[PDB]
């Protein structure tokens, strides 16, 4: 029942009504079937637009972060790491979302952890447990790999044991607005004439908030091996139950920062002659 | 009757055009006040009707042979236009739709084409290597608006940066190819076809109501898709006039007046 409209049979025409002529100045686009300019047979059209739906378009999970943590005894060492949860630092999922101005989705986050020994002589280590702790905005961040914040009394946390299936969770629509804003024509602060200095009202263009959706903190829970084990927690982000709300042209030139700014490679189109097929 | 001839009237103001090319209601939605099941603030909204919802005419810009384009932001272009600008500055939250009318008149012997585009959340690219560093006074130019450029000249004044935009014209000022801007609500003023364009804009935002001083809901971009030619003259200039009326203006959170630094 998802099928496209059938092409109707169309004979020759000699008519005062003319489908081919139009005026794109109106902003409308001419809604022609091929039956309205060429002769067509009837064909029962069994194709459908199922893979082009918005949930089908966004159904594939995409990498958004590669978080690196060390495990080594102190003698320079990253025993824990922290990442501000954003889509905008990997270009592919960012360009797919930035087809639209606003969107509204639940998320799946899938965590793939890969570890390796860092020097060949130092040998073996036992299996590692990884704590991935969500720190919402305003909650206390750790200042060491084993302070009180890792006790995770009110924070969500994933304890992943190494070699298991890649740990995953779902997160609801968490936005303060009714949809997430991919683009924001505005500021967080307005400078006023009564301000004591300009930096009271100065804020970044197109930034809504700093620490917008919080921080993921990652550590090895184990006490440190004498051998150095380096590990990477890759984070894969899948939007689901997606509704999108205002279409945009996709990004043509390369991305530069979390804004719409551009700096290099402002030549997205190649050379091809006007008469060359 | 014909859709070349339109009369638009809002408040005490009236536009008549005899060379229109229909009109665009953006995304099929005519502007409306906030319904009670979509409302966020509890404060009783000021809805001034005919005092704010009337056709205000911005400064006329001259289209010439080397013009690369012009842009404005809403509600920022109307921030000094009468009781709308006063209600916008006196209230924390504001919603309005807009009717954008662009007038551009030329003879049957002139040629040229303007694409008028209405962009929701029209972010523009900055002038420099520092990310997102465009100041408020330069991001909000008022009824003067801003201009597009043919190339990305980059600010190297380390002593004191300009903190402006650099909108490149074929990049639509934001890094997207201009031929795809027709997914936005749009009309073309093609001088053999029409002298005017009408886009009716609803309140497109992720919230029911928002800070009008902080945030621009729409950006209007006017770019010459085909350049202006007349006779065999190098000195051709024809006027473009942009007239915007708010529609369904409502405001919440009355306080002392916002006085932004410019």
């Amino acid at each position, epitope marked *: 029942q998802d099928s496209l409209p059938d092409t109707k049979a169309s004979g020759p025409a000699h008519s005062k009504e003319v489908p081919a002529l139009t005026a794109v100045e109106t902003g409308a686009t001419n809604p022609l079937a091929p039956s309205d300019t060429v002769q067509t047979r009837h064909v029962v059209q069994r194709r459908s637009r199922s893979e082009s739906t918005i949930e089908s378009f966004f159904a594939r999970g995409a990498c*958004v972060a590669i978080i690196e943590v060390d495990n080594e005894q102190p003698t*320079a060492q990253k025993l824990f790491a*922290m990442w501000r949860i954003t889509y905008k630092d990997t270009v592919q999922l960012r360009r797919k979302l930035e087809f639209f101005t606003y969107s509204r989705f639940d998320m799946e986050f899938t965590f793939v952890v890969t570890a390796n020994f860092t020097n060949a002589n130092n040998g073996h280590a036992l299996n590692q447990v990884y704590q991935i702790m969500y720190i919402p905005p305003g909650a206390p961040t750790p200042k060491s790999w084993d302070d009180y914040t890792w006790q995770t009394s009110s924070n969500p946390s994933i304890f992943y044991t190494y070699g298991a299936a890649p740990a995953r969770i779902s997160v609801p629509y968490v936005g303060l607005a009714n949809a997430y804003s991919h683009f924001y024509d505005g500021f967080a602060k307005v400078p006023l004439k009564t301000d004591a200095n300009d930096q009271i009202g100065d804020s970044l263009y197109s930034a809504m908030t*700093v620490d917008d959706f919080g921080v993921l903190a990652v550590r090895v829970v184990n006490d440190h091996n004498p051998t150095k084990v380096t590990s990477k927690v890759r984070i894969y982000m899948k939007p689901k139950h997606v509704r999108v709300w205002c279409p945009r042209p996709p990004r043509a030139v390369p991305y530069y920062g979390p804004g719409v700014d551009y700096r290099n490679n402002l030549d997205p189109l190649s050379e091809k002659g006007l008469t060359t097929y | 009757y014909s859709d070349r001839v339109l009369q638009l009237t809002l408040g005490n103001s009236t536009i008549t055009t005899q060379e229109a090319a229909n009109s665009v209601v953006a995304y099929g939605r005519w502007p409306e006040f906030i319904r009670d099941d979509e409302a966020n603030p509890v404060d009783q909204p000021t809805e001034p009707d005919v005092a704010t919802c009337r056709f205000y005419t911005l400064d006329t810009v001259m289209w010439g042979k080397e013009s690369k384009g012009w842009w404005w932001k809403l509600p920022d272009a109307l921030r000094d236009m009468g009781l709308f600008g006063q209600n916008m500055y006196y209230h924390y939250l504001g919603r309005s739709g807009y009717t954008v009318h662009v007038q551009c008149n030329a003879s049957k012997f002139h040629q040229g084409a303007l694409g008028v585009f209405a962009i929701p959340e029209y972010c523009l690219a900055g002038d420099s290597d*520092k990310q997102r560093y465009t100041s408020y006074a330069n991001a909000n130019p008022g009824e003067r608006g801003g201009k597009f450029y043919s190339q990305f000249n980059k600010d190297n004044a380390v002593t004191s940066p300009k903190r402006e935009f650099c909108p490149v014209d074929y990049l639509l000022g934001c890094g997207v190819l201009l031929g795809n801007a027709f997914v936005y609500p749009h009309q073309i003023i093609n001088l053999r076809t029409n002298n005017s364009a009408t886009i009716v804009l609803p309140y497109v935002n992720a919230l029911a109501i928002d800070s009008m001083v902080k945030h621009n809901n729409w950006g209007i971009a006017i770019l010459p898709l085909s350049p202006l030619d007349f006779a065999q003259d190098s000195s051709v200039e024809i006027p473009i006039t942009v007239t915007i009326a708010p529609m369904c203006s409502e405001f919440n959170g009355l306080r002392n007046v916002t006085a932004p630094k410019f």
Partner: antibody
Amino acid sequence: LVQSGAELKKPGASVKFSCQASGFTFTTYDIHWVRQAPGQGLEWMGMISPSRDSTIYAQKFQGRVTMTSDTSTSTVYMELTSLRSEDTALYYCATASRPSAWVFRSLYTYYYMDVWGTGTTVTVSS
Amino acid sequence: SALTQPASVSGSPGQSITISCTGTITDIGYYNYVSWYQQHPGKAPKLIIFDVTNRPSGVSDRFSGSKSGNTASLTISGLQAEDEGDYYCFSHRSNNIRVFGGGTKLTVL
């Protein structure tokens, strides 16, 4: 320890610095150059990343300064290709090797300068 | 374009002093890469706080650090005569350059 070259004293002409380190720290970490005119305070000049030979220079020096690398000796170099009297400064070589907990962009590790070399003065006058 | 610092700060031993460092919204107000460096005379600088409120190993707990907006602050609590010297603030800045403060000489009275 990170070892600097000796002191130079010439006006008007180009001056080349040398900075040698251990083989592991050269291949893993970035090398930053910082200068200090007498009493005037620290001033970041740029960065060489010998793992990939990418360079960044500060805008005060983007024409004037080139940085190059030697994998055989684990040495980095800096050449100040034109010189002025205000370049009379103590020039520091520093390895960025203290890692920040905050993930740089979303794919990389940020490093602060912790292994500073002893550095060298250059005086630029007749 | 350098980060603003007071040129000198003074206090007697046993007191708490606070050196402060104000930059723009594209360095301290956006990044948490805000560090502090201590320079006794003739020595190469020593990193004393790397991330905000984070000390390296072997740096005493009288040093402490915080961020309040576009401003970062270094508090030395229980000041001693060995703390006399220069203190340099540092941050990353969004065009991928790095910037030092102008430096504060601390005189222990």
